Amino acid sequence: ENAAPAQAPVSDRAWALFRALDGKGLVPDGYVEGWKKTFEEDFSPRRGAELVARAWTDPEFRQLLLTDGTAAVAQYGYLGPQGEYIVAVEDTPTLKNVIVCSLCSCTAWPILGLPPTWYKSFEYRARVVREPRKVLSEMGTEIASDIEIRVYDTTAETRYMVLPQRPAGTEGWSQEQLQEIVTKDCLIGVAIPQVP
């Protein structure tokens, strides 16, 4: 009762699917290898960090990023699969934004990178919509009591990034220096950028 179905090892099933399609000429030469390279090397939260650092140091770009995220991202050439319609959401002294896909894993792939295992977890998908303060706290981020938390559930085609507040002690830092402290978790919204 309630037992798992019998299954071949997952690797064997995944490669079987590949071989069945490839053996029928349906997968172009180097196709899955090319996607693997894109997923590993091109889709990256370093891109989102670059966008944040630019917004932090360039008021005009900040305004563009917050009003037409797609256009702002296109300037860097970072539009892509699962990242064609972009909205950046602004943290403020009274507002903390957090992103989830409660229904599956929807993520702005090209600028955040593919979602991490934890973001796709049933724990995050179930809980962050209902108890984001406790979830963030458990994850190591204390949100002050005077700050509203807003959770964006990625339920359609909008793909989101958080523009975090710029922390004190970074005044005059270069874009490269600022990029360094904007992590994947900062872009998802579960972390606040940290200054050593």
Partner: protein, 211 residues
């Protein structure tokens, strides 16, 4: 589809398995893990065999206990394989022969889907809307926590997309609709039993009505 995948608000789960900025390791933790997404794109972009929405729905169609015990990337192996069999591109026999053992698939659809709604309203930023009190057995991009609930429009998209309830079943009548960022107060969704402020759901026009 009111399936187990509609997890938002479910109670009883433990800690999220992460502390902020902890090392998450490589993008792929096994040598096969890039295959589901890559073969999804082959199916969508190269073969034109199915839509991305059909991939979401076929994963929703995993038998519920099967869904709950299956790691993320494996669900997409199962989903993409299921679609390839349903579309007549592959057989389950050849998948199992090549796999050297059982390769159970998602369950057949119990709904033919539905067309893009004929009657909808163009909403404006600041307007109060209700999520239509409707039950859809096939694919839908409305999490149940917002069904029948009232919120305020913060954004209307400047692009339009096919209605998921149609294109998620491969139907010809998905049309196109914009979506709306609808902001709900936490208390509107979970009463006293929430520690949050607001939740913004990105909802197709066809899921909404004036409040």
């Amino acid at each position: 589809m009111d399936g187990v995948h509609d997890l938002a608000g479910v109670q009883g789960f433990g800690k999220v398995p992460h502390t902020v900025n902890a090392d998450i390791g490589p993008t792929f933790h096994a040598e096969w893990e890039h295959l589901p997404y890559s073969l999804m794109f082959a199916g969508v972009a190269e073969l034109g065999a199915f839509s991305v929405d059909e991939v979401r729905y076929v994963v929703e169609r995993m038998e519920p206990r099967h869904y709950m015990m299956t790691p993320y990337y494996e669900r997409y192996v199962i989903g993409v394989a299921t679609l390839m069999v349903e579309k007549g591109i592959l057989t389950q026999d050849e998948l199992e022969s090549l796999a050297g053992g059982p390769f159970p698939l998602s369950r057949p659809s119990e709904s033919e889907g539905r067309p893009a709604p004929v009657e909808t309203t163009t909403f404006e930023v600041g307007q109060r809307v209700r999520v239509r009190d409707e039950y859809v057995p096939g694919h839908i991009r409305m999490p149940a926590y917002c069904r029948g609930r009232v919120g305020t429009i913060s954004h209307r998209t400047t692009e339009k997309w096919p209605f998921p309830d149609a294109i998620g079943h491969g139907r010809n009548d998905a049309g196109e609709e914009p979506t709306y960022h609808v902001k709900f107060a936490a208390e509107e969704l979970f009463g006293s039993d929430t520690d949050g402020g607001s939740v913004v759901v990105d909802l197709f026009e066809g899921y909404l009505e004036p409040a």
